[PDB]
Amino acid sequence: ECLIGPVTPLDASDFALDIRMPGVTPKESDTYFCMSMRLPVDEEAFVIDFKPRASMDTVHHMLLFGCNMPSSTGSYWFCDEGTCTDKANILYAWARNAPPTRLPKGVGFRVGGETGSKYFVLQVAYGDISAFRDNHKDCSGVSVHLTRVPQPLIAGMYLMMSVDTVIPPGEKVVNADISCQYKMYPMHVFAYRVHTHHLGKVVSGYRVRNGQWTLIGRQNPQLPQAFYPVEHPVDVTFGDILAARCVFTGEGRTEATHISDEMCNLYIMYYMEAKYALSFMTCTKNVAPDMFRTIPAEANIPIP
Ligand SMILES: [Cu+2]
């Protein structure tokens, strides 16, 4: 359980990093705790594997981000305060009773160097815990496999977030549409995660190419928000449009909710050939709203 060393070298090029809560005593149900772990190398390195070290009963949710400024410098903190004060580049999400996302063979996230993130920030959410267990420190976390051997495919995140959108009170279905033109080298989408708050019914993401929608994925965002795998990975390519839709319900809500708060985020996890690769992309617009008249019917079907 509690108390390998922080850094464990493996061959010339490889090392393991144990990212572990420093003996925390979670009081209270659904409390999100955070710790940072600086990268031991200044040079470019590649995260090529992950291994959860989650306590069985206590832990329901773990996230790992890549970023440059962690919100606290303390040995741990509460992620209510924040994760990183800058852009938090998400790398790994784990839920209990969830298919954990596993990097395809030659894929790694690019960290360190001038570009890449310097810190990992770990986020561990605990269940109901409860009972008469205050005499218990927890060291939950995850081990990361890093190497300085350059990888031929580089993983990254395409984040789609809604910003315009107002949820009127009482309307049973409200749609939040997001769309950008893709204008880079090809990316290959292998997983997705969806974030909303209370009112999300379902989030869906698509590549649209010559007016044909291909599914990237869809999920009820009230399920655990891990990275779900893509059945067959989707190449997204120059002149494709990425388009997302969230269905909210303002049933019972007392007044207008904006995006008292709500979010629609789609995390699209991809790989790109190392030379043309980018670690991060974003859409926060709906350039092609007219298009959504076309959207497959399956995108408005609830996932209860
Ligand atoms: Cu949120």
Author numbering: 46 to 48, 51 to 306, 311 to 355
Sentences from the paper on this structure:
PHM, a two Cu enzyme, catalyzes the stereospecific hydroxylation of the glycine Cα of peptidylglycine substrates. The two copper atoms in PHM, CuH, and CuM (located in the N- and C-subdomains, respectively), each use a single reducing equivalent from ascorbate to catalyze the reduction of molecular oxygen for the hydroxylation of the Cα of glycine at the carboxy-terminus of the peptide substrate. Crystallographic data on apo wild-type PHM and on several crystal forms of three CuH mutants (H107A, H108A, and H172A) presented here show that the copper ions are required not only for the catalytic steps but also for substrate binding and for locking the overall conformation of PHM in a configuration that is catalytically active.
Even though the molecule does not contain copper in the CuH site, copper at the CuM site has the same coordination and geometry as the wild-type. The CuH site displays only the minimum changes compatible with the mutation and the absence of its copper (RMSD 0.61 Å). The N- and C-subdomains come closer by a small displacement (<0.5 Å). More surprising, although it has no copper in the CuH site, the conformation of the two remaining histidines in this site, His 107 and His 108, is almost unmodified from that of wild-type PHM and the CuM site retains the same coordination of the copper observed in wild-type PHM.
